[PDB]
């Protein structure tokens, strides 16, 4: 009685979200990585001078 299931089966795997979050992490990660590559050009002055 303490433990019970709504249904024997489970909704479609497609409907379920495999990813832990879907805020936009994948997009954010790509933008951050791309920005870092570009950042080096802007950081060149500081980078050259220890």
DSSP 24: S
Contacts 24+ apart (CB under 8 A), 15-22: none
| CA gap 14, 44 in Å, rounded | 46
Contact 47, 40 (CB under 8 A): yes
Method by which this entry was solved: NMR
Q: Report the alpha-carbon distance of residue 42 to residue 48 in Å, rounded.
A: 11
Token pair of 11, please? 């909704």
Fold of 1-50: 6.10.250
Give the C-alpha distances (Å, rounded to integers) separating 20 from 4, 13, 31: 25, 14, 19
Q: Is 18 helix (H, G, I), strand (E, B) or coil?
A: coil
CA 41 to chain centre: 26
Q: Residue 39: enclosing H or E segment and its boundaries?
A: helix 25-48
Instruction: Return d(Cα 50, Cα 24) in angstroms, integer.
Output: 36
Domain ranges within the chain, ordered by starting residue: 1-50
């Amino acid at each position: 009685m303490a433990e019970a299931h709504q249904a024997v089966g489970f909704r479609p795997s497609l409907t379920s979200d495999g990813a832990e979050v879907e805020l936009s992490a994948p997009v954010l990660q790509e933008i951050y990585l791309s920005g870092l590559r570009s950042w080096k050009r802007h950081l060149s002055r500081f980078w050259n001078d220890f």
